[PDB]
Design an enzyme around this catalytic site. Structure first.
Site, PDB file in Angstrom:
ATOM      1  N   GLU A 134     -24.988 -58.888  -1.343  1.00  0.00           N
ATOM      2  CA  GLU A 134     -25.007 -60.292  -1.748  1.00  0.00           C
ATOM      3  C   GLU A 134     -26.382 -60.919  -1.484  1.00  0.00           C
ATOM      4  O   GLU A 134     -26.571 -61.763  -0.605  1.00  0.00           O
ATOM      5  CB  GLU A 134     -23.860 -61.051  -1.066  1.00  0.00           C
ATOM      6  CG  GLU A 134     -23.625 -62.454  -1.578  1.00  0.00           C
ATOM      7  CD  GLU A 134     -22.151 -62.781  -1.677  1.00  0.00           C
ATOM      8  OE1 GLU A 134     -21.380 -62.314  -0.815  1.00  0.00           O
ATOM      9  OE2 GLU A 134     -21.763 -63.500  -2.623  1.00  0.00           O
ATOM     10  N   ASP A 135     -27.350 -60.403  -2.248  1.00  0.00           N
ATOM     11  CA  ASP A 135     -28.733 -60.887  -2.274  1.00  0.00           C
ATOM     12  C   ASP A 135     -29.410 -60.713  -0.919  1.00  0.00           C
ATOM     13  O   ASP A 135     -29.980 -61.644  -0.355  1.00  0.00           O
ATOM     14  CB  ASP A 135     -28.812 -62.341  -2.750  1.00  0.00           C
ATOM     15  CG  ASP A 135     -28.153 -62.545  -4.096  1.00  0.00           C
ATOM     16  OD1 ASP A 135     -28.264 -61.648  -4.956  1.00  0.00           O
ATOM     17  OD2 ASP A 135     -27.525 -63.604  -4.297  1.00  0.00           O
ATOM     18  N   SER A 136     -29.338 -59.498  -0.398  1.00  0.00           N
ATOM     19  CA  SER A 136     -30.034 -59.122   0.817  1.00  0.00           C
ATOM     20  C   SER A 136     -30.702 -57.778   0.577  1.00  0.00           C
ATOM     21  O   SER A 136     -30.331 -57.038  -0.335  1.00  0.00           O
ATOM     22  CB  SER A 136     -29.081 -59.057   2.010  1.00  0.00           C
ATOM     23  OG  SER A 136     -29.769 -58.671   3.178  1.00  0.00           O
TER      24      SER A 136
END
Ligand code: MG
Ligand code: ZN
Ligand code: ZN
Ligand code: ZN
Ligand code: ZN
Lengths: 1089, 115, 138, 67, 482, 78
Positions: free
Chosen positions: E111-113
């Site tokens: 999730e966007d990491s």
DNA sequence: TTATTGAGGCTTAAGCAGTGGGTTCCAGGTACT
RNA sequence: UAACUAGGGAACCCACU
DNA sequence: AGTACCTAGCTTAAGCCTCAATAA
């Protein structure tokens, strides 16, 4: 402090009396000097009076000998030379002056009248509409025993009143003061003003209360309100000097006007059409009204919301190895925030070594609080004598592992944006969260910051632990479904983990079992023993699945004809999820089974096993699936975005055919051969035809792109797991992007009959008006690039204005009904103690424990309902196939049993008629507390019910058990006929569903429950119904406001504007409409219609 | 600011033990081996060498959190055997295998250098 | 509704105000329910009926249509402090001072201002010490 | 600003190859042939030299504040 | 378009584009293959290219700029547009070409990491330096002088190491400093014994450390002594630091693994950054994948790839054939092996060089906490600001949520005794606050002549201020205990 | 006769557990035996499961009257 | 016939989601010595 | 022979979710 | 010279204006 301590039970409001202002002010003689200091010391009688409070730090106040911390500030006063109008009371002064005689000072409408009595009867106990009604009746009255003098008309000119008779005179505030002074006490009663609290003459400013220095703190740097007070006292001294020496004609009037202006702009700086009170610096003065009104003001910005101690904020990062109720906090944050731990003999040694470590080490302490409130700072090192801890002391130790915190993310839209977590200390400088926790927080990890609040009392920590933990709020009351599901990587891999071809060797199984917290230590027997010992992923997830929950779900790629044709119970595509006895029989799991949807596996796990077991379920799913994904892996790349050459030819052929069709429609409209559709002109029917062709092309190209995807395609892998993306995204990447739209239409003629200067004029073709014929992999042409930029800009604008509009709707909704709650008599009332609902949701049940269920009696036909629900005590061999021998003999022989079974069926028929009255549409999907079908399935699995064998459950025991259970489920207490009727109404739907589901015929044939299984079923239904009742003290108004304002943030007028037009009562809606229904032949005849 | 020092991945601070023994209660003949300041490099070889042992009924290791530096090895054996001697024999076999590999690599070095 | 061959039973409106003025307060409660359900579930989302029913009952409990603005919420007998917590705090407090209104301190916002325990959730009851149950302690 | 001592990805020494890369480029080598002549085989080491910008030569155009 | 052989759609063309990519701005011209991306992602990259770290100017050594960030090893992109020659992005680049695998590895990039290579970061990968400049004047009004304060002659000195200053009151370059360390010693003379001068020294920011880089001393416009101090802080990429691609794919660092823990190809290449596969499909940043493929081709070939948007000489198939010519799989996938077990991953991972930027948002500039610190002077509530040791705001929506929880005691402690605990003495006849002399136990209400019936009421200080402002506006909010 | 619910609400659970934990931390005598438990929260949990908490809940009805319920008299959720 | 008291059309406030960081600015003007 | 705190406001701009 | 000091748009409720039955 010898004064007793107890809370405030009521706040009485009123206008401060001039006598009361004079006799409590410490500044005797009033403020007479505009200087703030004199000779380097504060001056008595000046603005910065030492009697009014403490001047500077480590000082004393002359009134109360307390320092700056405990001195509350003491009021003074300014005796005015001439009274002035209170600008906050000027409208009320204008209204009261019209209700009273200018000369008699009596009420304009005579008090000895039936109209005054009618006003007092209608406005009995409330003053505001009493004054409104007296103003309404006194409007137009000219003559008052009453005088014969005709009353004038009062008009406002800014801060000045003119009394005009129809000559006009300058209505001085002195004259208004003597008018209001001689108003009678009973005339104050009928005017809606208590003389004990608000005389009308007190509404004229004869003395000005100067606030103490705490209200207007001087940094040298005097407050601007102090500057306005200096101007006021300067002008007041000028009036005093002119009155007792000069006695000028019109200088006095100008000075009175200036004094009134200065007083009014002290109270309120923003008058309509008046000059602002400025300084030489060039800034308007902040008045007392401006200190309070705004969202940054006093009430909203400092009382409803305020900055707090013991809070922290940093960037959030993922942590799959934390539990869902855990937060990984930085060590520097935890070494900074402290929790005050009371010293007991049980923790004397641990707290003693925490004190000995001090504030320098992390696991230490910051302060020691002694029994007398004396605070010992451990940052600056004291002797061992006052490091000694005894029982009753408080040690403000550093925040450690297992500490309870509130974890928050703005914007806070519902209950689940502020959840309780357990503190774990982790090395680096970020907050760390489990991935399932991000969905209720609406959080991601691209730079999001979240706030941490550490509760300081033991009671507050306990109430967070018992009320606001993450597992306790897995299921929301907003939509009776889980808010936490299985998220991207875990979802994509668990779809790949639970396929039929997934096979794990012994080492992989033993590695995966290391990450089950709830594993019992027994390696299960493999699904394949020979030629290799080989487990499937369904066995491992069955070990993950807790308890003995039973759930039937459906995979996303499940064919519609599979449930009707052959192989419905042996799925060729493995697309029917069946969980029996807490183990996965078949089925591929996705977001339909492991997501946030109602009836999913996590929802059943929460409803059956509680919150702690479900928290373990979430953690075990994530850990096992991630550590298997280490083996399996998941990627995406260029090879997932391509198609073969045949699919590309199909896409190009479809696009060419669509462009030719649009060209043909353009030619038909150009040659005037296009007949318009009825109801619209040629432009709209041409646009409809072109949009139809382009939408058909987009759909056909999308289907052709979807048919080209292999099982190994990763776009398809993420889409059919539900983790990320959609079929539209795959179609846009592979086949065609499609038509770009602005405000629901194609790309407008921003130029002169052109979308761009690269086209000819009056070009209505696809590429000219914003149809992107290329895919994202192929690459957009520059015109298509610009049109796609237009569409994306429209999306960004919509997002920004959506947030900006939905915030105010959320705030208005929460402020409407924040005090509405369930009282202890199970009724719903507001702060006025007025009943809103007699039972919450009209059934008295909480919204987090109810489920979507189906009524089996509403929909079927009369003969089908008769066949399915009426017990057949005549067919002897059918009875012997369904029941045991003694039960069959009793059912056949006993006429009373047959009569009572017939009565049960008759009551079911009456319930059917009641249902068809309640639901005129045949929609049987209702929301009810106890999921009776799942409970029957649980009873079948627990007691090992064999459906092939006759049962030992007497149908008369079914009838009497259902009757006794219906007697037990009580929402409205009482043996009154009113109470009995309310109880029958509150549980009507559930009792109908219970008698329909737990009838004798169904228990005999379909469910085949035994006696002990039926008794367990009755007990379970009663227990889960009693757990479903709404608790008294539920803030159901706040819960309702959040539950209705939270879907607003993510969304013929529709959406946010229509919601706004419904929340406030709009007299002029944007799209007002009627839905006219026709009668007789005209409803079926188009010509009559 | 909150960066752990780089030596904490492999250096025991004063007070802890390198390896602790904990009996697993829910099944017989099972022990949990919590080893500090170690990682997948050692847990994987111990796990696989235990998996080669026919008297070992379960052999698995895990790192509970990658930010900390402990591994937990779970060994379950047959009742006529114990997880402690299984762990000992696995380490002994790994040591002897590495000794043989080292001396054969040295022989191959001399063979390649001398042609 | 008066027209020939127009059904006077099912013919309804989007307009809340005319439904209130033509059919009454319970009918406009039901119509407000249906309009809010439409505007919520148009996009396929679902909200429990408890919250919609509570919003409609709060907006229709006083006989008239109570708009959720300063013109419907700040015009009922909710007391000066919770009225001023919403909007026009200076005007509301000026009116309360002029009329001598008494705040009974029953809502959440009043107790939040005075820092007392709000009668809400854990604050909706009182705890007493049982002297007889303390005799069996050690 | 200056050539890194090691390739970030693998750790091969590339700090001794920037001047040789520039000398090969002025000897009318292509960039690929110059990378091949320096022994940079993995593309991780190849883009350390291919994508490098030598800001230090622009920094040296300013006179130091002390001398 | 100027070909008469076809119908040509027009034959009266008056003008021609010089190049269709010229419609983009400065920030949008940095995007490689922007015609293969969804347009909001191009907008996000145009936003975040202004937040990238590189060498912002060549003469940054002489500038005492406030808030300067410089990357140690900026690289020009392997995949560039032709407009970057005129943006001078080649000569002042902002970012590093990094070997990046798009994979699901241990779940720390979800999730966007991103997952960063710790061994790469040890070698200077995305290592940056942060510069902060402090300025201070001495004025003659009350005289301020740059001097080293001494406890025997100065008032208001904090508990800081004043020995780091020199004899001129200024710190020297090369001195290590931490939060609340004096860097400029300033003393202002009292207008009127034990203390003759008052301390008005300047300290660093509370959460900021570093090395003093440069101290410049001069005259200002009004002929007063003026000093500027630049503090050098070396910023290692860590967990929570924000990294973005050139396609709107931002993300913080989730974890850092060493080289032996990272997955590896058959050649021993480990990714510098691992991004999640789920960042791609809903975002539709296909330009990210095409830039990765072209970067692989460019790094193997020994050239700089051209990603000018509207270029028909470059498509995915040509790049794929070029990559296949270099012994790789044509779609950029490679067989990776697990770093922990050595077993090869069943799915072949898309990996190659793509251009990341280190954004200005480090977590160490955002981490904030407070137990009990300074309070505002008007209301006795926690102040605003991480630099002023302020408290976080428990706003109105937070109060609404805590109401909906039913947590009355937590709401009460947050809004009363975690912000501004206070108590007043109030009369019982009137609800006006009385006079309280605590040590003499003489609590009296002047106005009521009330000497005994005085009640202590625990109420927030902001509510006391509100009630005092109401009585300033001639409103009597009488607090009645009955 | 008491007309309120015989079940004990989660708000009552939260406040009773907090009050009892604060009392135990202030050295109130424990009504149950302790198997080495130290945290007053867990001691209050064990006291609540044994229905031994010496707290009477005064539930206030909206008409003004109240109803006194013992913790032992009420049904515990878990 | 005619004022007289009732009900339809014009202006004007009062509103308008949150969290950090940085920058500038909060006073000249003649007298007089 | 350790004498122990933080400081204002008003506007604008930028960034972030 | 240094300086005392005296001064863009929205919606909606509320307040304010001219024309028609009706008794004098
Ligand atoms: Mg985000
Ligand atoms: Zn005082
Ligand atoms: Zn009169
Ligand atoms: Zn390399
Ligand atoms: Zn009094």
């Amino acid at each position: 402090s010898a004064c007793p301590l107890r809370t405030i039970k009521r706040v009485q409001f009123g206008v401060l009396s001039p006598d009361e202002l004079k006799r409590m002010s410490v500044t005797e003689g009033g403020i007479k000097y505009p200087e703030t200091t004199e000779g380097g010391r504060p001056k008595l009688g000046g603005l910065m009076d030492p009697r009014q409070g403490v001047i500077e730090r480590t000082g004393r106040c002359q009134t109360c000998a307390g320092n700056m911390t405990e001195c509350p500030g003491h009021f003074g006063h300014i005796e005015l030379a001439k009274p002035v109008f209170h600008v906050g009371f000027l409208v009320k002064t204008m209204k009261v002056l019209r209700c009273v005689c200018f000369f008699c000072s009596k009420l304009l409408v005579d008090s000895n009248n039936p109209k005054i009595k009618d006003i007092l009867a209608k406005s009995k106990g409330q003053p505001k509409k009493r004054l409104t009604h007296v103003y309404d009746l006194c409007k137009g009255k000219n003559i008052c025993g009453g005088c014969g003098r005709y009353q004038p008309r009062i008009r406002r000119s800014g801060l000045e009143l003119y009394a005009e008779w129809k000559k006009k005179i300058l209505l001085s505030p002195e004259r208004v003061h003597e008018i209001f002074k001689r108003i009678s006490d009973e005339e104050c009663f009928v005017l809606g003003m208590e003389p004990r609290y608000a005389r009308p003459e007190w509404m004229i400013v004869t003395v000005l209360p100067v606030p103490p220095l705490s209200v207007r703190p001087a940094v040298r740097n005097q407050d601007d309100l102090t500057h306005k007070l200096a101007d006021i006292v300067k002008i007041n001294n000028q009036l005093r000097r002119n009155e007792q020496n000069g006695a000028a004609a019109h200088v006095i009037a100008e000075d009175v006007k200036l004094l009134q202006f200065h007083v009014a702009t002290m109270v309120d700086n923003e008058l309509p059409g008046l000059p602002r009170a400025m300084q030489k610096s060039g800034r308007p003065l902040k008045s007392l009204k401006q200190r309070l009104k705004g969202k940054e003001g006093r009430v909203r910005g400092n009382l409803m919301g305020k900055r707090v101690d013991f809070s922290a904020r940093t960037v959030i990062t993922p942590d799959p190895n934390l539990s869902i109720d855990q937060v990984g906090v930085p060590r520097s944050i935890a070494a900074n925030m402290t929790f005050a731990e009371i010293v007991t003999p049980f923790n004397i040694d641990r707290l003693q070594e925490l004190v000995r470590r001090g504030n320098s080490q992390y696991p230490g302490a910051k302060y020691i609080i002694r029994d007398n409130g004396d605070r010992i700072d451990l940052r600056f090192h004291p002797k061992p004598s006052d490091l000694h801890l005894q029982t009753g002391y408080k040690v403000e130790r550093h925040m450690c592992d297992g500490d309870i915190v509130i974890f928050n993310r703005q914007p806070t839209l519902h209950k689940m944006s502020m959840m309780g977590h357990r503190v774990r200390i982790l090395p680096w400088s970020t907050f760390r969260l489990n991935l399932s926790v991000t969905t209720p927080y609406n959080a991601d990890f691209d730079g999001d910051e979240m706030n941490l609040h550490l509760p300081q009392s033991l009671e507050t920590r306990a109430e967070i632990q018992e009320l606001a933990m993450v597992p306790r709020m897995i299921v929301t009351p907003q939509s009776n479904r889980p808010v936490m599901g299985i998220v991207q990587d875990t979802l994509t891999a668990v779809r790949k983990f639970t396929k039929r071809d997934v096979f794990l060797e012994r080492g992989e199984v033993m590695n995966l079992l290391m990450f089950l917290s709830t594993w019992d230590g027994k390696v299960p027997q493999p699904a394949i023993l020979k030629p290799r010992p080989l487990w499937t992923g369904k066995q491992i997830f069955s070990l993950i699945i807790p308890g003995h929950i039973n759930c039937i779900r459906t995979h996303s790629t499940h064919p519609d004809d599979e449930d009707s044709g052959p192989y419905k119970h042996i799925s060729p595509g493995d697309t029917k999820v069946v969980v029996e006895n807490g183990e996965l029989i078949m089925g591929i799991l996705c977001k339909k089974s492991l997501g946030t949807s109602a009836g999913s596996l996590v929802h059943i796990s929460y409803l059956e096993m509680g919150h702690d077991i479900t928290r373990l379920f979430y953690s075990n799913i994530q850990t096992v699936i991630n550590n298997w994904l280490l083996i399996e892996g998941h990627t995406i790349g260029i090879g997932d975005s391509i198609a073969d050459s045949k699919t590309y030819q199909d896409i190009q052929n479809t696009i060419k055919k669509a462009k030719q069709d649009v060209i043909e429609v353009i030619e038909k409209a150009h040659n005037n051969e296009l007949e318009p559709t009825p109801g619209n002109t040629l432009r709209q029917t041409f646009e409809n035809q072109v949009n139809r062709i382009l939408n058909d092309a987009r759909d056909k190209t999308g289907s052709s792109a979807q048919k080209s995807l292999s099982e190994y395609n990763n776009f398809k892998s993420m889409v059919v797991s539900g983790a990320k993306g959609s079929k539209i995204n795959i179609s846009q990447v592979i086949a065609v992007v499609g038509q770009q739209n602005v405000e629901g239409k194609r790309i407008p003629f921003g130029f002169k009959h052109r979308t761009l200067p690269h086209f000819i004029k009056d070009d209505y073709g696809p590429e000219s008006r914003g149809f992107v014929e290329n895919s994202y992999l192929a690459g957009l042409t520059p015109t298509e690039f610009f049109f796609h930029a237009m569409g994306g800009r429209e999306g960004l604008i919509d997002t920004a204005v959506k947030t900006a509009e939905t915030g105010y709707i959320q705030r208005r909704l929460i402020k409407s009904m924040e005090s509405v709650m369930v009282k202890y008599d199970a009724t719903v009332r507001n702060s006025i103690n007025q009943v809103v609902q007699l039972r919450y949701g009209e059934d008295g049940l909480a919204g987090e424990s109810v489920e979507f269920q189906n009524l089996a009696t509403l929909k079927p036909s009369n003969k089908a309902f008769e066949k399915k629900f009426r017990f057949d005590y005549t067919n002897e061999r059918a009875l012997r196939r369904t029941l045991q021998e003694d039960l069959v003999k009793d059912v056949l022989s006993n006429a009373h049993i047959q009569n009572e079974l017939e009565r049960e069926f008759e009551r079911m028929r009456e319930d059917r008629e009641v249902l068809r009255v309640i639901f005129p549409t045949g929609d049987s999907k209702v929301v009810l507390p106890c999921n009776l079908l799942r409970m029957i399935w649980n009873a079948q699995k627990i007691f090992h019910i064999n459906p092939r064998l006759p049962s030992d459950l007497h149908p008369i025991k079914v009838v009497e058990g259902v009757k006794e259970l219906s007697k037990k489920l009580v929402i409205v207490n009482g043996d009154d006929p009113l109470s009995r009727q309310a109880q029958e109404n509150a549980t009507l739907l559930f009792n109908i569903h219970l008698r329909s589901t737990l009838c004798s015929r169904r228990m005999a044939e379909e469910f085949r429950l035994s006696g002990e299984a039926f008794d367990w079923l009755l007990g379970e239904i009663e227990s889960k119904f009693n757990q479903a009742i709404a608790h008294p003290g539920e803030m159901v108004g706040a819960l309702a406001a959040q539950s209705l304002g939270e879907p607003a943030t993510q969304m013929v007028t529709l959406g946010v504007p229509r919601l706004k037009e419904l929340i406030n009562i709009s007299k002029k809606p944007k799209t007002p409409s009627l839905t006219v229904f026709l009668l007789g032949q005209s409803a079926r005849d188009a010509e009559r219609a | 600011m909150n960066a752990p020092p780089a030596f904490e991945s492999f250096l025991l601070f004063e007070g802890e033990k390198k390896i602790t023994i904990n009996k697993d209660t829910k099944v017989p003949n099972a022990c949990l081996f919590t080893i500090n300041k170690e990682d997948h490099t050692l847990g994987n070889i111990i796990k696989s060498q235990l998996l080669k042992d026919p008297q070992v009924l379960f052999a698995g290791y895990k790192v509970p959190h990658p930010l900390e530096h402990k591994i937990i090895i779970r060994v379950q054996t047959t009742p006529d055997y114990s997880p402690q001697e299984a762990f000992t024999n696995a380490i002994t076999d790994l040591i002897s295998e590495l000794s043989l590999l080292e001396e054969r690599f040295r022989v191959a070095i001399k063979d390649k250098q001398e042609g | 509704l008066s027209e020939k061959d127009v059904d006077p039973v099912r013919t309804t409106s989007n307009d809340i105000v005319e439904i209130f003025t033509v059919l009454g307060i319970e009918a406009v409660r039901k119509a407000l329910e249906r309009e809010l359900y439409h505007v919520i579930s148009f996009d396929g989302s679902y909200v429990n009926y408890r919250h919609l029913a509570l919003l409609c009952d709060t907006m229709t409990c006083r006989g008239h249509l109570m708009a959720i603005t300063r013109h419907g919420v700040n015009r009922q007998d909710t007391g000066p402090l919770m009225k001023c917590s919403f909007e026009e705090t200076v005007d509301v407090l000026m009116e309360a001072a002029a009329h001598g209104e008494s705040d009974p301190m029953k809502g959440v916002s009043e107790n939040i201002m005075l820092g007392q325990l709000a009668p809400a959730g854990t604050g909706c009851f009182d705890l007493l010490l049982d002297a007889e149950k303390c005799k069996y302690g050690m | 600003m200056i050539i890194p001592v090691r390739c970030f990805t693998c750790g091969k020494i590339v700090g001794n190859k920037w001047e040789a890369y520039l000398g090969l480029l002025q000897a009318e080598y292509t960039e690929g042939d110059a990378l091949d002549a320096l022994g940079l085989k993995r593309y991780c080491c190849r883009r350390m030299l291919l994508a490098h910008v030598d800001l230090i030569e622009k920094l040296l155009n300013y006179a130091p504040l002390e001398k | 378009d100027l070909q008469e052989k076809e119908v040509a759609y027009c034959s009266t063309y008056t003008h021609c584009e010089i190049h269709p990519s010229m419609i983009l701005g400065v920030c949008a011209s940095i995007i490689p293959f922007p015609d293969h991306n969804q347009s909001p992602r191009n907008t996000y990259q145009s936003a975040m290219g202004k937040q990238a770290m590189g060498v912002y100017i060549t003469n940054f050594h002489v500038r005492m700029d406030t808030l300067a960030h410089v990357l140690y090893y900026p690289q020009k992109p392997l995949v560039t547009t032709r407009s970057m020659e005129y943006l001078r992005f080649r000569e002042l680049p902002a970012g590093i070409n990094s070997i990046v695998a798009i994979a699901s590895y241990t779940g720390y990039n979800q999730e966007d990491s991103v997952i960063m290579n710790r061994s790469a970061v040890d070698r200077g990968f995305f290592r940056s330096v942060f510069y902060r400049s402090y300025k201070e004047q001495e004025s003659k009004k009350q005289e301020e002088v740059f001097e080293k304060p001494t406890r025997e002659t100065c008032q208001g000195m904090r508990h800081a190491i004043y020995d780091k200053l020199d004899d001129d009151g200024l710190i020297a370059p090369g001195v290590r400093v931490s939060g609340d360390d004096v860097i400029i010693g300033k003393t202002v003379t009292l207008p009127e014994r034990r203390y003759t001068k008052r301390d008005c020294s300047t300290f660093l920011r509370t959460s900021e450390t570093g090395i003093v880089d440069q101290v410049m001393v001069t005259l200002n416009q009004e002929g007063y002594k003026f000093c500027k101090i630049r503090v050098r802080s070396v910023r290692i990429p860590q967990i929570g630091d924000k990294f973005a691609s050139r396609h709107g794919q931002k993300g913080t660092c989730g974890i850092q693994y060493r080289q032996e823990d990272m997955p590896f190809t058959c050649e021993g290449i480990t990714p510098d950054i691992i991004i999640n596969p789920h960042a791609i499909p809903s975002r539709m940043t296909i330009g990210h994948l095409i830039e990765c493929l072209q970067g692989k081709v460019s790094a193997n070939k020994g050239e700089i790839g051209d990603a000018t948007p509207f270029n028909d000489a470059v498509n995915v198939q040509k790049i794929s054939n070029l990559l296949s010519d270099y012994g790789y799989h044509l779609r950029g996938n490679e067989v990776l092996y697990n770093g922990f077990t050595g077993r090869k991953i069943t799915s072949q991972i898309f990996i190659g060089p793509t251009y990341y930027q280190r954004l200005k948002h480090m977590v160490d500039d955002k981490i904030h906490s407070r137990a009990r610190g300074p309070i505002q002077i008007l209301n006795r509530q926690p102040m605003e600001g991480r630099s002023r040791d302020g408290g976080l705001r428990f706003g109105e929506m937070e109060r609404d949520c805590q109401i909906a929880h039913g947590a009355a005691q937590f709401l009460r402690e947050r809004l009363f005794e975690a912000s501004d605990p206070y108590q007043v003495h109030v009369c019982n006849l009137c609800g006006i606050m009385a006079i309280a002399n605590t040590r003499t136990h003489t609590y009296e209400c002047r106005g009521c002549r009330n000497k005994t019936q005085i009640s202590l009421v625990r109420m927030p200080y902001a509510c006391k201020l509100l009630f005092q402002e109401l009585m300033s506006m001639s409103i009597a909010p009488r607090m009645m205990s009955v | 006769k008491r007309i309120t619910t015989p079940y004990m609400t989660k708000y009552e659970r939260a406040r009773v557990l907090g009050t009892r934990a604060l009392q135990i931390a202030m050295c109130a005598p424990v009504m149950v035996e302790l198997e080495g438990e130290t945290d007053p929260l867990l001691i209050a949990m064990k006291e609540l499961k044994a229905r031994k908490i010496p707290i009477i809940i005064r539930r206030y009805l909206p008409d003004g009257s109240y109803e006194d319920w013992g913790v032992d008299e009420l049904i515990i959720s878990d």
